Design a protein around this motif. Structure first.
Motif, PDB file in Angstrom:
ATOM      1  N   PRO A   1       0.928  -1.306   0.115  1.00 41.75           N
ATOM      2  CA  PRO A   1      -0.072   0.020   0.063  1.00 41.75           C
ATOM      3  C   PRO A   1       1.040   1.365   0.152  1.00 41.75           C
ATOM      4  O   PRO A   1       1.295   1.699   1.056  1.00 41.75           O
ATOM      5  N   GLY A   2       1.130   1.789  -1.339  1.00 43.45           N
ATOM      6  CA  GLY A   2       1.586   2.981  -1.317  1.00 43.45           C
ATOM      7  C   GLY A   2       2.796   3.113  -2.398  1.00 43.45           C
ATOM      8  O   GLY A   2       3.526   4.169  -2.657  1.00 43.45           O
ATOM      9  N   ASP A   3       2.919   2.040  -3.167  1.00 41.31           N
ATOM     10  CA  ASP A   3       3.734   1.801  -4.351  1.00 41.31           C
ATOM     11  C   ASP A   3       3.114   2.481  -5.558  1.00 41.31           C
ATOM     12  O   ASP A   3       1.871   2.492  -5.638  1.00 41.31           O
ATOM     13  N   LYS A   4       4.006   2.753  -6.582  1.00 33.26           N
ATOM     14  CA  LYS A   4       3.472   3.682  -7.732  1.00 33.26           C
ATOM     15  C   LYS A   4       3.512   2.796  -8.906  1.00 33.26           C
ATOM     16  O   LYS A   4       4.743   2.541  -9.730  1.00 33.26           O
ATOM     17  N   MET A   5       2.509   2.264  -9.500  1.00 30.65           N
ATOM     18  CA  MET A   5       2.227   1.388 -10.641  1.00 30.65           C
ATOM     19  C   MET A   5       1.760   2.002 -11.722  1.00 30.65           C
ATOM     20  O   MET A   5       0.834   3.218 -11.576  1.00 30.65           O
ATOM     21  N   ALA A   6       2.192   1.795 -12.884  1.00 35.03           N
ATOM     22  CA  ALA A   6       1.616   2.758 -14.097  1.00 35.03           C
ATOM     23  C   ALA A   6       1.382   1.668 -15.226  1.00 35.03           C
ATOM     24  O   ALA A   6       1.427   0.549 -15.023  1.00 35.03           O
ATOM     25  N   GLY A   7       1.370   2.060 -16.375  1.00 33.88           N
ATOM     26  CA  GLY A   7       1.222   1.432 -17.594  1.00 33.88           C
ATOM     27  C   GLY A   7       2.097   2.152 -18.826  1.00 33.88           C
ATOM     28  O   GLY A   7       2.456   3.237 -18.582  1.00 33.88           O
ATOM     29  N   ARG A   8       2.273   1.597 -20.022  1.00 34.65           N
ATOM     30  CA  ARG A   8       3.133   2.070 -20.873  1.00 34.65           C
ATOM     31  C   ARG A   8       2.337   3.050 -21.341  1.00 34.65           C
ATOM     32  O   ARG A   8       3.121   4.070 -21.722  1.00 34.65           O
ATOM     33  N   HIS A   9       1.097   2.822 -21.635  1.00 32.32           N
ATOM     34  CA  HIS A   9       0.291   3.930 -22.370  1.00 32.32           C
ATOM     35  C   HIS A   9       0.265   5.485 -21.991  1.00 32.32           C
ATOM     36  O   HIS A   9      -0.178   6.437 -22.297  1.00 32.32           O
ATOM     37  N   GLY A  10       0.651   5.370 -20.383  1.00 40.89           N
ATOM     38  CA  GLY A  10       0.898   6.958 -19.841  1.00 40.89           C
ATOM     39  C   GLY A  10       0.032   6.945 -18.685  1.00 40.89           C
ATOM     40  O   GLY A  10       0.425   7.897 -17.868  1.00 40.89           O
ATOM     41  N   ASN A  11      -1.067   6.004 -18.211  1.00 39.93           N
ATOM     42  CA  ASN A  11      -1.751   6.177 -17.280  1.00 39.93           C
ATOM     43  C   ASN A  11      -0.911   5.961 -15.974  1.00 39.93           C
ATOM     44  O   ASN A  11       0.058   4.629 -16.037  1.00 39.93           O
ATOM     45  N   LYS A  12      -1.036   6.509 -14.953  1.00 35.64           N
ATOM     46  CA  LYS A  12      -0.119   6.410 -13.602  1.00 35.64           C
ATOM     47  C   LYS A  12      -1.094   5.958 -12.513  1.00 35.64           C
ATOM     48  O   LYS A  12      -2.336   5.751 -12.793  1.00 35.64           O
ATOM     49  N   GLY A  13      -0.571   5.511 -11.333  1.00 38.22           N
ATOM     50  CA  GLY A  13      -1.297   5.002 -10.370  1.00 38.22           C
ATOM     51  C   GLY A  13      -0.374   4.522  -9.135  1.00 38.22           C
ATOM     52  O   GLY A  13       0.656   4.429  -9.109  1.00 38.22           O
ATOM     53  N   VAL A  14      -1.029   4.905  -7.837  1.00 39.42           N
ATOM     54  CA  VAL A  14      -0.425   4.472  -6.690  1.00 39.42           C
ATOM     55  C   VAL A  14      -1.431   3.498  -5.864  1.00 39.42           C
ATOM     56  O   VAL A  14      -2.579   4.112  -5.706  1.00 39.42           O
ATOM     57  N   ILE A  15      -0.990   2.349  -5.436  1.00 44.06           N
ATOM     58  CA  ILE A  15      -1.969   1.415  -4.734  1.00 44.06           C
ATOM     59  C   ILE A  15      -2.483   2.022  -3.426  1.00 44.06           C
ATOM     60  O   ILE A  15      -1.709   2.436  -2.450  1.00 44.06           O
ATOM     61  N   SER A  16      -3.777   2.045  -3.409  1.00 42.74           N
ATOM     62  CA  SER A  16      -4.239   2.652  -2.085  1.00 42.74           C
ATOM     63  C   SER A  16      -4.460   1.612  -0.840  1.00 42.74           C
ATOM     64  O   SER A  16      -3.748   1.885   0.015  1.00 42.74           O
ATOM     65  N   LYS A  17      -5.253   0.651  -1.160  1.00 45.63           N
ATOM     66  CA  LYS A  17      -5.185  -0.674  -0.397  1.00 45.63           C
ATOM     67  C   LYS A  17      -5.395  -1.865  -0.894  1.00 45.63           C
ATOM     68  O   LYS A  17      -6.299  -2.242  -1.432  1.00 45.63           O
ATOM     69  N   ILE A  18      -4.165  -2.482  -1.030  1.00 48.56           N
ATOM     70  CA  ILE A  18      -4.151  -4.056  -1.939  1.00 48.56           C
ATOM     71  C   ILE A  18      -5.069  -4.988  -1.049  1.00 48.56           C
ATOM     72  O   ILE A  18      -4.681  -5.584   0.013  1.00 48.56           O
ATOM     73  N   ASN A  19      -6.093  -5.097  -1.457  1.00 51.62           N
ATOM     74  CA  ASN A  19      -6.990  -5.841  -0.892  1.00 51.62           C
ATOM     75  C   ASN A  19      -6.978  -7.462  -1.260  1.00 51.62           C
ATOM     76  O   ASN A  19      -6.320  -7.714  -2.004  1.00 51.62           O
TER      77      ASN A  19
END
Lengths: 227, 52
Positions: B30-48
């Protein structure tokens, strides 16, 4: 509320089976459906190799001159090994092999309690003949997912440099879904049948598991009946 | 063996340097920064759990 009861439990394969209950009521098929899935995905008696002490290998970041894959990868194939046990909650096996060839889950010193679901699961390959590899496989049985990271405070003092510890993933299940449909009773407004589909690695039985689920749910009924 | 025996000289004065390697596995949490090649970004909120 007219009680539910199990109809024939559909046992088709060791991998996957389907428990089925006929006398469910209006909406309880959905009710207990998601409820029990939580159960079958958390509190589950699973088996997992935890300690792999090796003859010549000290750290899993080495390669025994004779083995094919890296030792760390061979240990991940051990995480990929599905085995069920019966009495011992802690048991050690012994892989004894020397000679060029894919070592499947049969060549290991198979204990009576230890029982592999698919002995065709090659773990590692050997490329040299005069390569004597002997490794003790300490597998234990608990539940849920328990990493050596969370267990490192105790650590049990691993000064002896030969102790390799991989993750203890006690997870039998793999893919669970439940089939809801109109129960075809002949005299009732409505009832629901539930054919709970459960995918398994192939180690824990359906009915055995559901009675365990009921037992866990039994503890969970205690307090709510006594406020 | 020549390279192994005398190729250890590093810096003038400090000819004896001991370099140690420390392997540390870092996982996803919970807190890692995941993304995609296409450009969309993201940070895991709560890995359920996969239950949900």
């Amino acid at each position: 509320f007219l009680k539910p009861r199990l109809v024939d439990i559909e046992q088709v394969s060791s991998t996957h089976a389907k428990v089925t209950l006929e006398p469910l009521e209006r909406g309880f098929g959905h009710t207990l459906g998601n409820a029990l899935r939580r159960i079958l995905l958390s509190s589950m008696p699973g088996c997992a190799v935890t300690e792999v002490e090796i003859d010549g290998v000290l750290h899993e970041y080495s390669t025994k001159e004779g083995v094919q894959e890296d030792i760390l990868e061979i240990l991940l194939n051990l995480k990929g090994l599905a085995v069920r046990v019966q009495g011992k909650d802690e048991v050690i096996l012994t892989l004894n092999k020397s000679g060029i060839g894919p070592v499947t889950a049969a060549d290991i010193t198979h204990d009576g309690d230890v029982e592999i679901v698919k002995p065709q699961h090659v773990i590692c390959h050997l490329t040299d003949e005069n390569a004597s590899i002997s490794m003790r496989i300490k597998v234990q049985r608990g539940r849920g997912y328990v990493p050596a990271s969370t267990r490192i405070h105790s650590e049990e003092d691993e000064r002896p440099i030969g102790r390799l510890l991989v993750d203890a993933c006690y997870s039998p299940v793999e893919r669970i879904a439940y089939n809801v449909e109109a129960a075809r009773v002949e005299q009732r407004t409505d009832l629901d049948k539930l054919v709970i589909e459960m995918e398994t690695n192939g180690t824990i039985d359906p009915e055995e598991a559901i009675r365990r689920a009921a037992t866990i749910l039994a503890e969970q009924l205690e307090a709510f009946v006594d406020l | 063996r020549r390279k192994i025996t005398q190729g250890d000289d590093l810096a003038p004065g400090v000819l004896k340097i001991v370099k140690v390697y420390l392997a540390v596995k870092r996982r996803i949490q919970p807190g890692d920064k995941m993304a995609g090649r296409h450009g969309n970004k993201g940070v895991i909120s709560k890995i359920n759990p996969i239950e949900d």
